[PDB]
Amino acid sequence: AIPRERVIKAVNELIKFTSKPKNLLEDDEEELKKDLQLIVVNNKSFTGTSKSFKLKLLNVKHSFYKPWKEASATAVKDFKVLLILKDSDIKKVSEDDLFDQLDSEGIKVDEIICGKDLKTVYKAYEARNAFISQFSLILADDSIVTSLPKLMGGKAYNKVETTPISIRTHANKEFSLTTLTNNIKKVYMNQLPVKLPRGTTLNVHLGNLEWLRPEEFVDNVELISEQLIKAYQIRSIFIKTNRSPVLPLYYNQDVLDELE
Amino acid sequence: RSQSEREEEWLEKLYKKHGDDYKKMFFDKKLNIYQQSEGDLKRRLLRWKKRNGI
Amino acid sequence: PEYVRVQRQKKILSIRLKVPPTIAQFQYTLDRNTAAETFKLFNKYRPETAAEKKERLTKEAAAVAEGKSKQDASPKPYAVKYGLNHVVALIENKKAKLVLIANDVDPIELVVFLPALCKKMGVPYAIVKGKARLGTLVNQKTSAVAALTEVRAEDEAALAKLVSTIDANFADKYDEVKKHWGGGILG
Amino acid sequence: PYEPLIDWFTRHEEVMPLTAVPEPKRRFVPSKNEAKRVMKIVRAIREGRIIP
Amino acid sequence: EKFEELKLSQPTLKAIEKMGFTTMTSVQARTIPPLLAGRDVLGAAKTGSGKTLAFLIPAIELLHSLKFKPRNGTGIIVITPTRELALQIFGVARELMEFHSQTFGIVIGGANRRQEAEKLMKGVNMLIATPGRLLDHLQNTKGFVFKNLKALIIDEADRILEIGFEDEMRQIIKILPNEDRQSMLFSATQTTKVEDLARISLRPGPLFINVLEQGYVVCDSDKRFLLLFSFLKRNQKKKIIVFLSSCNSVKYYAELLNYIDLPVLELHGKQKQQKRTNTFFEFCNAERGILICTDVAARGLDIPAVDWIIQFDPPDDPRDYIHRVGRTARGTKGKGKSLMFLTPNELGFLRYLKASKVPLNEYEFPENKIANVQSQLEKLIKSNYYLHQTAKDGYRSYLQAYASHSLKTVYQIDKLDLAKVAKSYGFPVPPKVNITI
Q: What keywords are assigned to this protein (chain C)?
């Protein structure tokens, strides 16, 4: 596996790093950047030789969306939850139907949007980018997911929050509200998004240090990393703040022998 | 002078949605679409209560 | 006949004589494609007819007659605005996002202040050609005015570029020649 | 003679309306007179004078 | 002593009970037996000691002892420099006169003239007014019952003189009767030209009782309320008091931010004073709270050691603001960081800050971090009639507050883009307010 002890060493090093200190009233976005964890994976041929806008949802022990939301109440940008559903789906599903299910576990859908609404109400780059930039959590039906990228705009596919997440209301022939109900729970608190770019570089976003426990950070990182090792042949792992330099934790030197 | 059945039913919906408080039901969008006056709400509810439901 | 003789002798005695510059701002009007897209815009915002109105009334009234009080929800009606005093009324707030002005009105003096009034109020007016084409988009015989205020979010971006299009095509092209005395050349 | 028209008064633009007329209530809520016509039709259908 | 000990009519007793007053402040406890005795007086007292109520009680005693009709006279006349202080004195006086039978009114330059005219035609048994508009109403309004003058008071003759209304005051007193009139006046300090008006006014011989960096944030006038909202969200769980000018904007901003569900306490002259006391008590004991208030309602009461002083609106007295930040620093061992919003027309205030010689810190603004709720604001104002009217009222009272401002060299209405001000309030088109521009 991976020496958890070394991960605790590195995260305490990063806590000490971010603990190092006419000023702004409203704080710098860069100051918010220099507090956040990003996982970086060197791995052989992370392309599928093709663009992959589909996000892999990794099973994670802890859920950073709740400390996200709790700090987002204090923060300027407010955490919002977007679902994009079919026309008949929105005709059937109502909002209190969602809200009653989500107050059970204490979360909230902000909005639900049809593809019609994407293709006529926000068929304008300014309004569409402004509407997308409000949101952190974007969900979409798996049927609509492969219809999205003409409607969403590539500016939505640039960032990690702005790109949508595959989610399914169906389990049988028709959809069930139970499936969407527990499925938003699965995608919310038990899974984390993964962009899949080209090259040998993978960037995985974890989150601000102030949100979670550092050993809980270590547990989530080691779980994700074992999931990645079992997934892909991996050259190396550097985790860091996007202001900070890298931190080498784990690497496999024989992967590069096995490529060719 | 009694009350009409639709609007007393409307008041009955408001009485169960908010209860008795008026600042919440004043800023209610659904079932206060005419945006009734703060105290007209009180007057109609007191007339409705004296009519029915104490 | 007499009336054919007069309607041919009309527009001769006008152009033969010097027209004041507060007239002949009319017929310095909007070109072909821009008026076409303006009509494509306003046919998206046709007002409800009396038949469609009464039909929706009968639907909701049969709903309440069953009762079957379905919900209490409707966003707003959006439509063009077409009453002349109502059009002027939507200015001096201001509320008029676009105004179309017919060139041909037989009491012209009903209309003559409206370009200067939207000029000083900064309202994006445009002089349209033919009040019958205004009446068609508003279910009247003629209308002679056409104000539009409220627009859905699907159409709001089209609105702004149409405004910029008109201010490029009308306010830039015809502004100085608006000041000049038209006509005066004999027939 | 003739001379082009002076636009001394147009070129200053009013940033505000003329009148400080307070906005009415009925511009914001669903239309009342509509609803009175609705209840008229409801009373006619309750008497059966209008068929659904 | 106590207010409830002294000889009073029973509706005044009910009034004092409902305003929460039982005890007396010492200087007002001194001046009240001459206030009942019928002598003229001048007085040095701090702004906001309750010195409004100090004259309010025996004035209503005089109106109770005379019992005259609304057609009969005006009697009690109140001269006060600031429109804001006029509204505060009026809002305190409303419930007092409400348990009483007589009549209460407002004369303010910047109000609707036919409104004030019709109220004068009906007659008003207690007038509260600004000095400038009084010459207009005395010289111009016909049939107004002027000949009585049971009494008259001046408040803060320093501020009348510092504005410069004293010649208007001389013309007023030359219009005023003297023999029926008694004159009472409060001014914390005094000058010679104050005493010259005092020698004209005070009809008997009177006995009188005498007892650091700043933040500055230059913002455009549209985005300043948005930036206030953003900074208030970022500094949530920190108690902060915001200083305003107009009570309407106080009530409107409080209702707005409560509609955006972040917890906000309001504090203004239209607030009932027992409720006002409740809000101040809850702010002081809650210690993490948002307090919205005017300048002079904040002046009227001592301030807990706060995380931030934020001043949104222009000041009533900038000199008192310079003394107030100094006494705030020297009184509070806990650090209270002071900031004022600025508009790019207002930078001359800065050089008056450079006249104050206290240091200054510019606090910068990122255009990226903008809360972007202004579209939601405009959709809300197009939705809610009630919020629409309160927004228009905050806008109206804001512009009339600029109209009532003294330092024209710091504030000109001609400088201001009212389109941006309306967009800050949330109007795409500025509503018409009948203001001389």
A: Cytoplasm, Ribonucleoprotein, Ribosomal protein
Distances (CA, A) of E254 to A110, E279, E407: 25, 12, 28
The DSSP code sequence of E54-65 is HHHHHHHHHHHH
Contacts of A120 in chain C (CB under 8 A): 154
Domain total of chain C: 1
Record the tokens describing residue E41, joined without a space. Answer: 């007086």
Q: Which residues contact A27 (CB under 8 A, 6 or more apart)?
A: E234, E369
Residue with the two structure tokens 């059009």? C87
Proportion of chain D in helix, strand, coil states, percent, rounded to 5: 35, 0, 65
Residue of E nearest to D22 (CA): E389
Instruction: For residue C120, give its domain range.
Output: 1-187
3 state DSSP class of E222: coil
CA-based nearest residue to E127, from E95, E98, E89:
E89
Q: Do residues E158 and E80 lie in contact, with contact meaning Cβ atoms separated by under 8 Å?
A: no
Contacts of E231 in chain A (CB under 8 A): 25-26
State the nearest Cα–Cα gap between A121 and chain C, in angstroms. 4
Residues of C in contact with D14 (CB under 8 A): 120-122
CB A71 within 8 A of CB A208: yes
- Is-contact E76 E127, C-beta < 8 A? yes
Question: Would the CB atoms of A23 and E365 count as touching at under 8 Å?
Answer: no
Q: Does C64 touch chain B (CB under 8 A)?
A: yes
What's the N-to-C CA distance of chain C in angstroms? 21
Judge whether E309 and E241 are in contact, CB under 8 Å: yes
Structure tokens at C133: 């084409």
Side by side, the strands of the sheet bearing E214-218 are: E264-267, E290-294, E240-244, E308-311, E337-342, E214-218, E360-362
Which of C57, C121, C181 is opposite residue D37, by nearest beta carbon? C57
Experimental method used, please? cryo-EM
Provide the terminal-to-terminal Cα distance of chain B, rounded to the nearest Å: 18
Q: What is the amino acid identity at position A67?
A: P
Measure in Å the smallest separation between the Cα of C182 and chain D Cα atoms. Answer: 10
| CATH code at position C32 | 3.30.1330.30
Cβ distance B6 to C73 less than 8 Å, yes or no, reads no
Task: Determine whether the interchain pair B33/C72 forms a contact, defined as Cβ–Cβ distance below 8 Å.
Answer: yes
Cα Dmax for chain D:
74
* CB-based contacts of E1-5 (< 8 A; 24+ apart in sequence): E1/E29, E3/E57
The region, left, alpha or beta by phi > 0 then psi within -120 to 50, assigned to residue E36 is alpha
Pick from E343, E331, E299, E310: which is nearest to E239 by CA?
E310
How large is the angle between the packed helices D32-46 and C50-66, nearest 10 degrees? Answer: 60
* Dihedrals phi, psi of A246, to nearest 5 degrees: -75, 170
